[PDB]
């Protein structure tokens, strides 16, 4: 329902400081929105940088820091590097669903694995079960989220599953379309999509998380094409 707005693009130079912001259409961003910041490199390489406003994901360089500034959330890069040229997304929580910002292309002048099939091709009307095989961590200690991205459109949160208890939570838009399950013996999360139409053509990502700590590691996505 809400709309999350980021700068279209920004340009910085190595060694400089750059600030990206994340705005909520409903009012000020508070810590109750649990903003996460995720970085997209080419070849569908998403990595989480900050979770829950200000916590840095372990292993992320110290030059990344998250905070609140005025009514907005902010990602500050102090001493930017050429490798920081990428697209930066923020996510906000609204009581029961995540909403993605539109992303900021940052131009710079000058172990845990989530394995997804690269693509799928099915005729309309079919059902499919996408997979996400994990390694490098103990599977049932983390939730698994699913996110999709339609061509020319933004990231949209589908839902999550907790492998231990089994509990799921879905975005209203996807309740009739998607069902999340796990197979713990093989460290695999599944998402079943039913009665596919051409509007279901998109890249579908699995992304790791746990309570208060979401979107740190990502699969590379399954590009699903529905066509007759």
Spatial strand order in the sheet of 72-78: 4-6, 17-24, 72-78, 64-69
Q: By C-alpha distance, which of 102, 104, 92, 99 is closest to 18?
A: 104
155-161 vs 168-170, strand pairing mode: antiparallel
Q: By C-alpha distance, which of 63, 1, 225 is closest to 130?
A: 225
Q: Is 215 helix (H, G, I), strand (E, B) or coil?
A: strand
Beta bridge pairs of residue 41:
45
User: In whole angstroms, how far apart are CA 97 and each of 87, 187, 193?
Assistant: 22, 25, 19
- Spatial neighbors of 75 by CB under 8 A, at least 6 apart, are 19, 20, 22, 37, 49, 50, 64, 65, 66, 88, 90
55-56 vs 45-51, strand pairing mode: antiparallel
- Which experiment gave this structure? X-ray
What does the chain come to in residues? 228
Q: How many C-beta atoms surround the C-beta of residue 98 within 10 A?
A: 25
What is the end-to-end Cα distance of the chain in Å, rounded?
32
- Resolution of this entry in Å? 2.0
Give the span between the Cα atoms of 120 and 211, in whole angstroms.
Answer: 31
User: In whole angstroms, how far apart are CA 209 and each of 155, 191, 216?
Assistant: 17, 16, 7
CB 88 within 8 Å of CB 106: yes
User: In whole angstroms, how far apart are CA 153 and each of 86, 101, 102?
Assistant: 18, 11, 9
* Residue 26: both structure tokens together: 């409903």
CB 159 within 8 Å of CB 180: yes
**Helix intervals (H) in the chain:** none
Beta bridge pairs of residue 146:
159, 206
Q: By C-alpha distance, which of 180, 188, 128 is closest to 159?
A: 180
Give the span between the Cα atoms of 134 and 150, in whole angstroms.
Answer: 24
CB 215 within 8 Å of CB 35: no
Q: By C-alpha distance, which of 143, 146, 156 is closest to 193?
A: 146
Q: By C-alpha distance, which of 22, 2, 28, 24 is closest to 10?
A: 22
CB 133 within 8 Å of CB 188: yes
- Spatial neighbors of 4 by CB under 8 A, at least 6 apart, are 22, 23, 24, 25, 90, 91, 92, 99, 100, 101, 102
- Spatial neighbors of 134 by CB under 8 A, at least 6 apart, are 112, 113, 114, 115, 144, 187, 188, 189, 208
The torsion of the CA quartet 133, 137, 143, 149, rounded to 10 degrees, works out to -50
Question: Maximum distance among all alpha carbons in the chain?
Answer: 52
Q: By C-alpha distance, which of 151, 158, 173, 172 is closest to 209?
A: 158
């Amino acid at each position: 329902q809400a709309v999350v707005t980021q700068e279209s693009a920004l340009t910085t130079s190595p060694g400089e400081t750059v600030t990206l912001t994340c705005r909520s259409s409903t009012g000020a961003v508070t810590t109750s929105n649990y903003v996460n910041w995720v970085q997209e490199k080419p070849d569908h390489l998403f990595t989480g940088l900050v979770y829950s406003t200000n916590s840095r994901v372990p292993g992320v360089p110290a030059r990344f820091s998250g905070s609140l500034i005025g009514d907005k959330a902010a990602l500050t890069i102090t001493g930017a590097q050429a490798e920081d040229e990428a697209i930066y997304f923020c996510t906000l929580w609204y009581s029961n669903h995540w909403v993605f910002g539109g992303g900021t292309k940052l131009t710079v002048l000058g172990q845990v694995q989530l394995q997804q099939p690269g693509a799928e091709l099915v005729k309309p009307g079919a059902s499919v079960k996408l997979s996400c095989k994990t390694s490098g961590y103990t599977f049932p200690y983390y939730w698994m989220h699913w996110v999709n991205q339609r061509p020319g459109r933004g990231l949209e949160w589908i839902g999550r599953i907790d492998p231990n208890g089994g509990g799921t939570r879905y975005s209203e838009k996807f309740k009739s379309k998607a069902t999340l399950t796990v197979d713990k013996p093989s460290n695999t999360a599944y998402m079943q999509l039913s009665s596919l139409t051409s509007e279901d053509s998109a890249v579908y990502y699995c992304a790791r998380g746990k309570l208060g700590q979401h979107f740190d590691y990502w699969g590379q996505g399954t590009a699903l094409t529905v066509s007759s």
